[PDB]
Amino acid sequence: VWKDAETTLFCASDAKAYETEKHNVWATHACVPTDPNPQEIHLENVTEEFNMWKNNMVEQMHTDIISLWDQSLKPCVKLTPLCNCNTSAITQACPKVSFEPIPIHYCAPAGFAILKCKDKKFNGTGPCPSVSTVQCTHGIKPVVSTQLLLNGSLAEEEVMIRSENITNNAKNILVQFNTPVQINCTRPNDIIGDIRQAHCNVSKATWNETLGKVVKQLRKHFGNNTIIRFANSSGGDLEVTTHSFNCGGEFFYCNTSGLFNSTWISNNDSITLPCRIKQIINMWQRIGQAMYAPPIQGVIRCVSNITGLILTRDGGSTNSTTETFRPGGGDMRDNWRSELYKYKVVKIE
Amino acid sequence: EVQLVESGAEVKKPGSSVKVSCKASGDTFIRYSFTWVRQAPGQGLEWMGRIITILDVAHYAPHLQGRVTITADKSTSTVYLELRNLRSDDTAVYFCAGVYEGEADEGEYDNNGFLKHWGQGTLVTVSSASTKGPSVFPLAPSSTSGGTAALGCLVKDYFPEPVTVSWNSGALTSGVHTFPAVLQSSGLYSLSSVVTVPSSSLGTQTYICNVNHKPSNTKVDKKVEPK
Amino acid sequence: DIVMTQSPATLSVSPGERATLSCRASESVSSDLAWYQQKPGQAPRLLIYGASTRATGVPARFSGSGSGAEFTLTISSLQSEDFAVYYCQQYNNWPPRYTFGQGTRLEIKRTVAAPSVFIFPPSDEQLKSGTASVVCLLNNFYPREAKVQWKVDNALQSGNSQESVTEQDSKDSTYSLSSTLTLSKADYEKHKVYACEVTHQGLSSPVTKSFNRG
Amino acid sequence: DIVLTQSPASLAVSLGQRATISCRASESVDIYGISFMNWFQQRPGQPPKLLIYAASNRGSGVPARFSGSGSGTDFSLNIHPMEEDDTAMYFCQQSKEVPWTFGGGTKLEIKRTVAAPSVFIFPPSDEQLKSGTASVVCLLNNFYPREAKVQWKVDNALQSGNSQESVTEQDSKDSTYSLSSTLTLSKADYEKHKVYACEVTHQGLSSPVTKSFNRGEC
Amino acid sequence: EVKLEESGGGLVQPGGSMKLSCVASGITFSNSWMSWVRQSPEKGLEWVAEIRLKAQNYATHYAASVKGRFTISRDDSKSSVYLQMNNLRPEDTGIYYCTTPLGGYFDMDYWGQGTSLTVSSASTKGPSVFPLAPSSKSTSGGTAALGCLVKDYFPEPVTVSWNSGALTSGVHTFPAVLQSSGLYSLSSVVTVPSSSLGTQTYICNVNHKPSNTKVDKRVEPK
Ligand SMILES: *[C@@H]1O[C@H](CO)[C@@H](O[C@@H]2O[C@H](CO)[C@@H](O[C@@H]3O[C@H](CO[C@H]4O[C@H](CO)[C@@H](O)[C@H](O)[C@@H]4O)[C@@H](O)[C@H](O[C@H]4O[C@H](CO)[C@@H](O)[C@H](O)[C@@H]4O)[C@@H]3O)[C@H](O)[C@H]2NC(C)=O)[C@H](O)[C@H]1NC(C)=O
Ligand SMILES: *[C@@H]1O[C@H](CO)[C@@H](O[C@@H]2O[C@H](CO)[C@@H](O[C@@H]3O[C@H](CO)[C@@H](O)[C@H](O)[C@@H]3O)[C@H](O)[C@H]2NC(C)=O)[C@H](O)[C@H]1NC(C)=O
Ligand SMILES: *[C@@H]1O[C@H](CO)[C@@H](O[C@@H]2O[C@H](CO)[C@@H](O)[C@H](O)[C@H]2NC(C)=O)[C@H](O)[C@H]1NC(C)=O
Ligand SMILES: *[C@@H]1O[C@H](CO)[C@@H](O[C@@H]2O[C@H](CO)[C@@H](O)[C@H](O)[C@H]2NC(C)=O)[C@H](O)[C@H]1NC(C)=O
Ligand SMILES: *[C@@H]1O[C@H](CO)[C@@H](O[C@@H]2O[C@H](CO)[C@@H](O)[C@H](O)[C@H]2NC(C)=O)[C@H](O)[C@H]1NC(C)=O
Ligand SMILES: *[C@@H]1O[C@H](CO)[C@@H](O)[C@H](O)[C@H]1NC(C)=O
Ligand SMILES: *[C@@H]1O[C@H](CO)[C@@H](O)[C@H](O)[C@H]1NC(C)=O
Ligand SMILES: *[C@@H]1O[C@H](CO)[C@@H](O)[C@H](O)[C@H]1NC(C)=O
Ligand SMILES: *[C@@H]1O[C@H](CO)[C@@H](O)[C@H](O)[C@H]1NC(C)=O
Ligand SMILES: *[C@@H]1O[C@H](CO)[C@@H](O)[C@H](O)[C@H]1NC(C)=O
Ligand SMILES: *[C@@H]1O[C@H](CO)[C@@H](O)[C@H](O)[C@H]1NC(C)=O
Ligand SMILES: *[C@@H]1O[C@H](CO)[C@@H](O)[C@H](O)[C@H]1NC(C)=O
């Protein structure tokens, strides 16, 4: 017997105390070591209700990652507005620090447990007959990125399509893949080329197959009609209108117009997306802008696999005949929800 | 590249403030950062501060932090320097300078600290003295031994700098030395202009020194004669 | 506060030869070090940035080297237009508190040249105005170092004269100097012989020029 | 709305030859190189059956003699060689945007060789007779062409005004027609006369055929 | 197997109301756009209404000829779509089909058999059914003809089968004719082996949905 309630959770991590990397330092001075003997107890004849879009663990992880990015990244200039409109300015040294997200487990204190749904077809909200109880969720890398989801978990069998309300075109949609799509972002080293110019290479065959699977799952969810064009983001900051992420402390903003041309009414080069290194960024913590330091020397390499993405529907399918989606993101609460969808905190009764 | 054109010379009493401007033309304003540097007469360059134009964020030298302000008007491509509570030791030439930072509008910013482009400078004089034109006195040639004679004009008790001196309405330049001015204990400037001419030319050739002091709109022509 | 020190204060180099200027920092500044050229009456001109990168428009005969806290500017063959004042600048710190060296004056080394000495008594007009300026002129000498003393009735004067010196002459590489003695009319009329004594490397013995008042 | 002008309204084609049906749209039905136009076949009493989708794609199981072509505003359905079970209504339907619209329809029929009718006559039933009315029926079975003259005579008196004709759809298997002619009389009028005769004239008959009966003679 | 089944037609007076229903089987109905299309007595096709999916906020659109008078709705839990028809008009007469998808992209669609709607104010009446008996004076070599006369019914349509659907070869059921009385009539005939006339039983099954009546009539030699 238990009840649906929230509490002040803590964090566990395998952070190295000798590692100067900022995620390790944060998880060392703010989290305990991981559970040396973790266990997952299945619940017999228990059908529990879950709702990822109304989960407090998402907000807890969001606040923890905000604190991590505030204590870790030291930009050269900080600007925080408030809107008569006037702002402020914070100035401090901006050294180059190592950046690489590490898995972070979220554990519940005494008297509380974490219910995890084991349904391979669990779409996000609703009942679940295969429930288990744990104390700490599995390791989740806090990869702060827009549009694309990197270094996350995969769907079990079919591609998962989740949304707080697919009927509302304002609420965003998240797509969790069943197979990952490799992506190799590189900023080469000698004086040739721009200092901020980089490129992400991705195999077009696997991306084509996964995009076909994604539009097929869109059809299975609703429509079966014409998923039209698949364009890019319509207006907004450079953080939402392009794939914005971080690699080794450098902020990469990559052009995603190459992977967005799905003229599918029904149904050996690679895709090379250009990228720029922006120091003057708009922080995802809604606290204004931040200017950092020039990139380091040598080559900047990041090889990951896309495991999911986020889109936004333009409700044109009601009166027309086609279906428009555009790349979204920004609110990293959706990024944390893409991994905290099957977990919920419960109070033991 | 960008051309920097500064505002005109200023004369201020101690305790006042001054605001100098600098127009940047020829390139994307927001892709440059701008710096102000001053140089007191006879001394070296002193870094005062730098504004990150794209961000509207300025940083100042510790010694004057609190009484200096650097601003930029993106709509007129103009940079401003304000110095408050002026002291006599603030007398200097003020240079506007800038450097290209990258594609700032696309988040690229080198944060360069060196200064590629420089303005022509703005003289700012801070002194209790009031504007007044120079007295011009002859330095008559004497019996200046040899085949060469020396003569000139003493340009005394003027304020502020600068003063311009020519000879024979610009017809005489060979052998002219116009000395840098000195500051007298009275707070007024003084300089001499001399010229060496053949001694056989005295009595036949007339030598007139032309002294122009724009601040007080004074123009004096002084004939310098033997005896 | 990073203090930048340049050496030497003045460098005298014969035209067409190599010049080496040194800049030292009080702590390491990596390679964030720039060199500028400034000619009298003009704005500075960027020559070197990043310790060793020549700015656009700078001839190849200028080259920068060094790192850390010690830097060097070498000019392989001095042209007439290279004689000027040179400044180094540190821009390594953040928050920015950039500082300049105090400059090295690069002048033209020529043969020794003795000054021509002239003395000018005050004009009747100025005496009528109530003050007496006596001017001693040292014309077209080299090197710049020169000593000028005022004697009024054999009494060595101090604290009542001012000196001015021209820029190095662009044609003959010499300097000129003025010394102006100012006194009230009563003091001027209280003494008889007014003499300026010039000491200079070009003179075997001090040169004295004088006049008797009236 | 996208108006579809289908032509012709009525089409007769010889077996073994090509039937061509057109359909012009008031505006383009193309999106991204695909023409969202469809063709349907409809047999009498049955719902529409999709023959062609997206201008040129044969439906699953649709015989190879059916094909579609066209783009933009101009489309055609071609059946070649047309077979006898192809007689039907055909329609052109745009699927580009709502409101979904249909062509006015084409009735596809077929010229065949001459076939003489079989002629039958039916007296009114005793059950109907007691009700007060008499219907006498003359049937022409499995003939071609459709044109035929059916004349009722009652004791040699040529009847007019009291009979009605009805004709079947062209048969899907033998491409013939059948026709009924029904003579309606009051019971009293029917009992006034003895001999009821139906005379049929048709191109397949070398001599018009009369079928007759004497009232009440089994 | 996929099936659509319409029901609910019948006779209604101008200004009256009727509700049609369509039930789907063998299909994932919640993922199908559903439309109603009608076919005039003139046999031309006219789209009436469409309803889209939950994700399109069940958006509905109506042809101008029916806008404000008809309402389309669906019940995904019962795999059914409905057409409520109010303020009916003469021009609403026709056979109503439910279909899916029928729009844009394609390779396969589905249609019901249709349900018939008639306007007017005339009162109903099931047909009288009389035998068309095979005649000694009406045969040929072998091959005789017999039938049923389906007389004095209103409105259209009737359907006629033979031997409960076991007899289909050689059957001709003629289009109805409107008589001067305002009632319809037709014949259905069939040719059979005349050697069978003493052996094989022949029964015509006459259904008239508007009156909800069924008549079976055995047809024998007189
Ligand atoms: C999703 O997960 C993937 C993991 O698959 C991450 O990808 C990696 O990204 C990190 C950093 O972004 C890469 O790390 C870099 O690795 C270099 C490897 O170099 C050598 O050193 C090792 C040490 O044992 C030798 O074995 C090897 O032979 C080479 O000699 C390092 O050299 C790099 O250090 C550089 O950057 C730091 C930054 O501060 C500098 O201080 C260093 O001096 C140096 O210049 C750097 O650590 C790693 O290689 C990537 N691949 C793998 C397989 O790990 C993605 O980053 C992650 N997603 C996100 C968004 O982070
Ligand atoms: C991301 O990549 C795309 C393509 O890889 C970039 O788009 C390109 O955008 C330019 C806009 O200037 C297009 O140029 C054109 O100019 C002609 C002038 O006549 C005009 O007629 C065209 O309609 C068009 O506007 C260009 O065609 C287009 N594609 C390519 C291959 O260059 C885009 O700028 C990149 N960045 C972002 C943020 O999307
Ligand atoms: C995931 O599946 C659930 C099924 O439980 C969907 O939820 C339903 O929500 C709609 C809201 O429009 C209700 O009308 C249904 O009654 C709900 N179903 C049940 C069984 O109660 C949910 O929409 C699906 N999608 C997501 C993204 O959660
Ligand atoms: C990208 O995919 C690779 C696939 O190998 C991941 O590597 C892990 O690979 C080992 C291979 O022995 C598997 O057992 C693990 O299950 C994989 N982990 C995951 C999370 O897929 C790699 O971790 C993925 N992510 C990257 C490279 O960022
Ligand atoms: C299009 O709509 C159909 C609705 O039937 C979806 O259909 C079925 O697809 C599943 C896939 O696993 C099969 O198991 C069922 O047998 C199918 N049913 C029928 C009646 O065909 C389909 O998933 C939708 N999306 C597409 C085709 O991309
Ligand atoms: C669990 O439920 C099943 C039926 O779903 C029932 O047969 C079984 O007895 C239940 N077991 C327990 C322990 O409740
Ligand atoms: C989803 O959004 C639509 C339109 O905004 C609204 O009608 C519907 O009630 C919403 N449903 C939920 C569950 O939020
Ligand atoms: C780099 O990109 C290529 C191209 O897809 C990929 O095959 C490779 O695995 C990536 N990583 C490395 C280390 O080469
Ligand atoms: C990506 O592709 C480009 C184009 O061929 C190539 O020049 C580059 O080396 C590739 N980078 C990687 C990491 O594969
Ligand atoms: C994508 O995959 C499909 C299915 O294999 C194929 O038909 C299509 O040509 C592919 N397109 C590209 C660009 O690889
Ligand atoms: C997509 O990218 C183009 C750059 O080519 C940009 O102009 C546009 O605003 C972006 N968004 C769209 C088309 O919605
Ligand atoms: C569709 O049409 C309705 C009117 O029935 C209107 O309210 C709605 O805004 C339209 N939506 C779009 C996307 O055009």
What CATH number does residue C156 fall under? 2.60.40.10
- Dihedral, CA atoms, D100, D105, D108, D109, nearest 10 degrees? 140
- Residue in E21, E38, E32, E39 with CA at minimum distance from that of residue E84: E21
Q: B166-171 contacts: CB < 8 A, separation 24 or more?
A: B166/B209, B166/B210, B167/B193, B167/B195, B167/B207, B167/B208, B167/B209, B167/B210, B168/B206, B168/B207, B168/B208, B169/B208, B169/B210, B170/B210
Q: Burial level of A239, CB count in 10 A (0-12/13-18/19+)?
A: buried
CA torsion sign, E97 to E98 to E99 to E102?
positive
Contacts of A222 in chain E (CB under 8 A): 31, 53-56
Please list the residues that pair with B138 across neighbouring strands.
B153
H helical segments located in C108-201: 124-129, 185-188
- Residue identified by tokens 């998923």 is A227
Residues D123, D103: one domain? Answer: no
At which of E92, E119, E146 does a domain end? E119
Q: Give every CB contact of residue E70 below 8 A, 6+ residues apart in sequence.
A: E48, E49, E62, E83, E84, E85, E86
Task: Give the closest-approach CA distance of D97 to chain A in angstroms.
Answer: 6
Residue type, B37: V
- Residue E63 to residue E96: CA distance in whole angstroms: 14
Tell me if chain E has a CB within 8 Å of the CB of A225: yes
- Residue at which a domain ends, from C110, C125, C142: C110
Architecture of domain A1-142+332-349: Beta Complex (2.170)
CA distance A153 to A139: 10
Ligand 7 pocket test: pick from A167, A222, A317 the residue with the most ligand atoms within 8 Å of its Cβ. A167
- Classify residue B202 by its DSSP letter: B
Q: Which of D97, D164, D213 sits opposite E137 (nearest CB)?
A: D213
Beta bridge partners of C66: C71
CATH code of the domain containing B198: 2.60.40.10
Biggest CA-to-CA distance, chain A: 67
The total number of structural domains in chain E stands at 2
Resolution of this structure in Å: 4.3
C-alpha–C-alpha distance, residues C146 and A44, integer Å: 106
Structure tokens at E212: 């909800």
Count structural domains, chain B.
2
Domain identity same for E135 and E155 = yes
Domains of chain C: total: 2
Q: Identify whether residues B52 and B120 lie together within a single domain.
A: yes
Q: How far is CA C196 from CA B154, C123, C124, C179, in A?
A: 18, 17, 20, 9
CA distances for E194 relative to D121, E147, E221, angstroms: 15, 13, 11
CA distance D32 to D28: 11
Taking the C-alpha atoms of residue D25 and residue D104, their distance in angstroms, rounded to an integer, is 12
CB-based contact, E169 to chain D, within 8 Å: no
Q: Contact at 8 Å (CB) between B41 and B124? A: no
Q: Are residues C175 and C188 in the same domain?
A: yes
Do D78 and D150 sit in the same domain of this protein? no
Mark yes or no for CB contact C166/B154 under 8 Å.
Answer: no
Six token digits for residue B182: 């000195």
- Pick from B210, B211, B192: nearest CA to B154: B192
Q: Are A225 and E104 in contact (CB under 8 A)?
A: yes
Residues 6+ apart with CB under 8 A from C144: C10, C107, C165, C168, C175
Do residues C172 and C88 both lie within one domain?
Answer: no
Nearest one of A325, A345, A330, A344 to A175, comparing CA atoms: A325
Q: Are residues D86 and D126 in the same domain?
A: no
Structure obtained using: X-ray
Q: How far is CA B6 from CA A94, B11, B21, B123, E100, in A?
A: 33, 15, 6, 10, 76
Please answer whether residues B172 and B220 qualify as being in contact, where contact means their C-beta atoms are separated by less than 8 angstroms: no
- Nearest Cα to Cα of residue D88 among D4, D180, D13: D13
Determine the Cα–Cα distance for residues E190 and E165; give it in Å rounded to an integer.
13
How far lies D93's CA from each of A122, A227, A322, C165, in Å? 41, 22, 18, 101
As a whole number of angstroms, the distance between CA E203 and CA E146 comes to 10
Helix (DSSP H) and strand (DSSP E) numbers for chain E: 0, 19
Residues in chain B: 227
Determine the distance from the C-alpha atom of residue C84 to the mean position of all C-alpha atoms in its chain, rounded to a whole number.
11
Q: Are both C102 and C115 inside the same structural domain?
A: no
Q: Do E106 and D167 touch (CB under 8 A)?
A: no
Q: Do C103 and C115 have their domain in common?
A: no
- The answer to whether chain C touches chain D by having 3 or more C-beta pairs less than 8 angstroms apart is no
A125 lines ligand 8 (CB under 6 A): no
Nearest residue to E188 via CA among E175, E202, E201: E175
Residues D65 and D44 in one domain: yes
- Is residue C122 a contact partner of residue B135, using CB atoms and an 8 Å limit? no
Q: What is the C-alpha separation between B78 and B24, in angstroms, rounded?
A: 6
**Final residue of a structural domain among E99, E119, E139:** E119
- Structural domain boundaries, residue E158: 128-219
Q: How far apart are CA A27 and CA A30, in angstroms?
A: 5
User: Cα separation of A65 and A58, whole Å?
Assistant: 11
E31/E114 same-domain check = yes
Pair (B34, B119) in one structural domain? yes
CA–CA separation, D197 vs A238, rounded Å?
94
Neighbours of chain A (3+ CB pairs under 8 A): B, C, D, E
Two structure tokens written together for A332: 């990293």
D99 and D130 share one domain = no
Residues B10 and B115 in one domain: yes
Q: Are residues C80 and C95 in the same domain?
A: yes
Q: Which of C50, C99, C139 sits opposite B196 (nearest CB)?
A: C139
Beta strands A300-314; D157-158: pairing state: unpaired
Clarify whether residues B13 and B115 are in a common domain: yes
Is the shortest distance between the CB of A29 and ligand 5 below 6 Å? no
Best of C32, C52, C94, C97 to substitute, by most chain A Cβ atoms within 10 angstroms, is C94
Report the alpha-carbon distance of residue A62 to residue B92 in Å, rounded: 54
**CATH code for the domain of E46:** 2.60.40.10
CA–CA dist A325, A335 (Å, integer):
18
Neighbouring chains to E with at least 3 Cβ pairs closer than 8 Å: A, D
Could you list the residue range(s) of the whole structural domain that residue C90 is in? 1-110
Q: How would you class C16 by CB atoms within 10 Å of its CB: exposed for 0-12, middle for 13-18, buried for 19 or more?
A: exposed
Residues E7 and E112 in one domain: yes
Alpha-carbon distance C44 to C74, whole Å? 18
**Chain E interface includes A171 (CB < 8 A):** no
Shared domain for B19 and B61, answered yes or no, is yes
Q: Which of D82, D110, D138 is the last residue of a domain?
A: D110
Instruction: Output the six-digit token pair for C13.
Output: 């180099």
Structure tokens at E120: 């007017």
D207 contacts D47 by C-beta, under 8 angstroms? no
Give the count of beta carbons closer than 10 Å to the beta carbon of residue C26.
Answer: 13
Considering the domain architecture, whether residues D127 and D102 belong to the same structural domain is answered as: no
Token representation of residue D182: 């029904």
Quick one: which of B57, B78, B73 has its CA closest to A289?
B57
Please, how many CA atoms are within 13 Å of residue E210, restricted to the half-sphere of its CB? 21
Q: What are phi and psi of A337, to 5 degrees?
A: -70, -25
Interface test with A, best of E35, E51, E56, E74 (most A CBs within 10 A): E56
Q: Which of A163, A169, A216, A225 to mutate to test the interface with E (most CBs of E within 10 A)?
A: A225
- Indicate whether C35 and C103 sit together in one domain: yes
- Residue where a domain terminates, one of E78, E100, E119: E119
Torsion of CA C4, C5, C6, C9, to 10 degrees: 140
Tokens of A250: 């450098």
Indicate whether B104 and B22 sit together in one domain. yes
If you classify domain A145-331 with CATH, what class do you get? mainly beta
Residue B60 lies in domain: 3-126
Q: Which residues contact C41 (CB under 8 A, 6 or more apart)?
A: none
Residues E142 and E192 in one domain: yes
Answer whether A45 contacts ligand 6 (Cβ < 6 A). yes
Ligand 2 centre to CA of A242 (Å) is 15
Vertex A292 angle, CA A290 and A298, to 5°: 150
Count the helix, strand and coil residues of chain B and give each as a percent rounded to the nearest 5: 10, 50, 40
DSSP E101: -
HEC readout, chain A: CEEECCCCCEEECCCCCCCCCHHHHHHHHHCECCCCCCCCEECCCCCEEEEHHHCHHHHHHHHHHHHHHHHHCCCCEEECCCCCCCCCCEECCCCCCCCCCCCEEEECCCCEEEEEECCCCCCCEEEECCEEEECECCCECCCCCCCEEECCCCCCCCCEEEECCCCCCCCCEEEEEEEEEEEEEEECCCCCCCCCCEEEEECHHHHHHHHHHHHHHHHHHCCCCEECCCCCCCCCCCCCCCEEEEECCEEEEECCCCCCCCCECCCCCCEEEEEEECCCEECCCCCCEEECCCCCCCCEEEEEEEEEEEEEEECCCCCCCEEEEEECCCCCHHHHHCCCCCEEEEEEC
Same domain assignment for residues E188 and E209: yes
List residues bridging with B35 in a β-sheet: B50, B97
Is A306:A183 a contact under the CB 8 Å cutoff? yes
Instruction: Kindly state if the Cβ of A303 falls inside 6 Å of ligand 8.
Output: yes
Domain boundary among C110, C138, C170: C110
Contact D80, D38 (CB under 8 A): no
Residues 25-44 of B with CB under 8 A from C: 35, 37, 44
Q: Is residue E188 domain-shared with residue E154, that is, in the same domain?
A: yes
- Could B152 and C176 be called an inter-chain contact, meaning their C-beta atoms sit closer than 8 Å? no
Q: How far is CA A296 from the centre of its chain?
A: 25
